[PDB]
Design a protein around this ligand. Structure first.
Ligand SMILES: [Cl-]
Ligand code: NA
Ligand code: NA
Lengths: 58, 59, 59, 55
């Protein structure tokens, strides 16, 4: 799988999996923005993650 | 009692929503989209063409 | 286990998609299309007329 | 072009051509058609080394 040079580059699997879950949950409970264009869909959401992760990415 | 936003999720059924949430989760895990440090926190953004059944509805 | 977008790729067979992926990798290496910055990250976009066979499937 | 590839070296540009190629196959991005022909677009964050350069 692709290894992007964004904030996931500094997180371990557990931490990345915690964040993947955050995003999936937010999508289900109505948070963020799902929009469509010519291309397809874009989902965007912002949040403050748990402190353990927040210290690492903030 | 979850918020029900008026974005594209407004046009989609529960199954369609659950499928897309799965796309978003997996995309996060497989390194797609962009995870940046925003003002106070994180922003995750990802773009994709959904599977055919959903594509029919959104296109 | 890959994502199966409902875009034109939905309508193409494995070999036609293989060929197009090659067309795209080639175009990138020879200066075609446009590689630009943000969205957070990179966007690459390229337009082209594919072979007559693929052409008929996609129009 | 005088886009980002202008400033990227051969290893970097090859890496990205491989990203683009793999993303096409794994279903990421958007393949659409016009009266023209086909358009493929995909966005992504490259490996740190390249992301550090283009951001
Ligand atoms: Cl948000
Ligand atoms: Na896609
Ligand atoms: Na086109």
């Amino acid at each position: 799988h692709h290894e992007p040079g964004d904030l996931r580059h500094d997180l371990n699997q557990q931490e990345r999996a915690t964040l993947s879950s955050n995003v999936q949950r937010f999508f289900m409970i109505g948070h963020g923005s799902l929009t469509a264009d010519a291309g397809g869909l874009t989902y965007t959401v912002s949040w403050v993650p748990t402190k353990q992760i927040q210290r690492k990415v903030a």
